[PDB]
């Protein structure tokens, strides 16, 4: 899978980025059984002030995780995975989980290429 | 919902970013009935020259809005919402709406976490 | 369609960005029959060190192509298109295709606006 993680510049130090990537990657392996190296976490940083909630400009605390997954998992499993990402990123980023948004999009495996192969 | 708004650096001043966020957020509330604070607008800025149309490098005017929505709305309603975003962002960004692209992706509610809850 | 291309800053020169955009755009026209000017390629650059694979921080070689398409094409056609993007971006970016990931998401045409029209 690919987890696009949208954060404000300077909110996550390199150590914190590694910790957040580990939290997400461990949650995905542990709950779905997929191998480690298949989980990409891709941080997309923007300057603070680019996030609006209800039209109101925010500081730099929002973390939006957009997970791009293969179709075929149960709703219960996807909910457990989203909840684990919230809990574990809250620990890893030392952040109130009110700041964490997680959306999963799914795709047929036949239109997903990882490491240059299907 | 989350609206990822892809723009070129310097095309939108902070005032214009606030106006565009307000246009999108107001359109989403008004047409779907969802509450204000649930609408995130997340601006993703890149240097001018990173956008190609038909292989041709563009200036800094393209605005691509990628809305990430819960499934369950009618095609007519989604079309009205997309059209309103085009019209209202055209006003808010003082931009020819030939420059505005809007795509909506949808997801089951059970795999969407906002503010740390489902 | 819109192809969001996630790369590390400095991996692609402007010439290489043009070559990669041409590879993707030509593959989409040639295989699907859509017109040239309808294909947007939008490069999203981030500093090297923002990509993790299996929790391990990478250099600047990963290229993730997220294609946003209209629904309605066959699985075989989508697979041929993904494979062509891998091959042709490998040539255009002078890069081992082990570094190239390609995911396609699809949407009803009625919720896709390009150039300010449906």
H/E segment holding residue C66: strand C63-70
3-state SS assignment for residue C84: helix
Provide the phi-psi class of B100: left if phi over 0, else alpha when psi is between -120 and 50, else beta: beta
Beta strands in chain A (DSSP E): 2-8, 40-46, 51-53, 56-57, 63-70, 100-107, 112-113
Tell me the sheet residues that pair with B67.
B3, B104
Resolution to one decimal, Å: 1.3
Whole-number Cα distances in Å, B22 to A38, A59, B49: 39, 17, 27
CA dihedral B107, A53, A100, A97 (to 10 degrees): -130
Angle between helices A75-92 and A14-32 (to 10 degrees): 160
Return the CATH superfamily for domain B2-111.
Macrophage Migration Inhibitory Factor (3.30.429.10)
Helix (H/G/I), strand (E/B), else coil: C92:
helix
Q: For the residues of A1-17, what is the DSSP string, one character each?
A: -EEEEEEETTTS-HHHH
Was domain C10-111 assigned CATH 2.40.30.20?
Answer: no
B70 is in an annotated binding site: yes
State the chains in contact with B (3 or more Cβ–Cβ pairs under 8 Å). Answer: A, C
Q: What is the largest CA-CA distance in chain B?
A: 43
> What is the bridge-based pairing of β-strands A56-57 and C112-113?
unpaired
| Residues of chain C neighbouring B98 (CB-CB closer than 8 A) | 115-116
Does residue B112 contact residue C112 with C-beta atoms inside 8 Å?
no
The technique is: X-ray
Would you state the structure tokens that stand for residue C90, as one six-digit string? 């490998």
Give burial (CB, 10 Å; 0-12/13-18/19+) of C29.
Answer: middle
Report how far apart the first and last C-alpha atoms of chain A are (Å, whole number). Answer: 12
CA of C104, closest CA in chain A: separation in Å?
6
Nearest by Cα to A85 from B25, B112, B53: B112
Q: Which residues contact B91 (CB under 8 A, 6 or more apart)?
A: B23
Structure tokens at A43: 């941080």
The residue extents of the domains of chain B are: 2-111
Sheet bearing C2-8, strands edge to edge: A112-113, C100-107, C63-70, C2-8, C40-46, B51-53, B56-57
Rounded to whole angstroms, the Cα distance separating C76 from C88 reads 18
């Amino acid at each position: 899978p690919v987890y696009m993680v949208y954060v404000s510049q300077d909110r996550l130090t390199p150590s914190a980025k590694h910790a957040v990537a580990k939290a997400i990657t461990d949650a995905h392996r542990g709950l779905t059984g997929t191998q480690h190296f298949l989980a990409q976490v891709n941080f997309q940083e923007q300057p603070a002030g680019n996030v609006f909630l209800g039209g109101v400009q925010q500081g730099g605390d929002t973390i939006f995780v957009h997970g791009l997954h293969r179709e075929g998992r149960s709703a219960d499993l996807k909910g457990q995975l989203a909840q684990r990402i919230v809990d574990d990123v809250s620990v890893a980023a030392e952040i109130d989980r009110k700041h964490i948004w997680v959306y999963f999009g799914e795709m047929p495996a036949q239109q997903m290429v990882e490491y240059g192969r299907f």
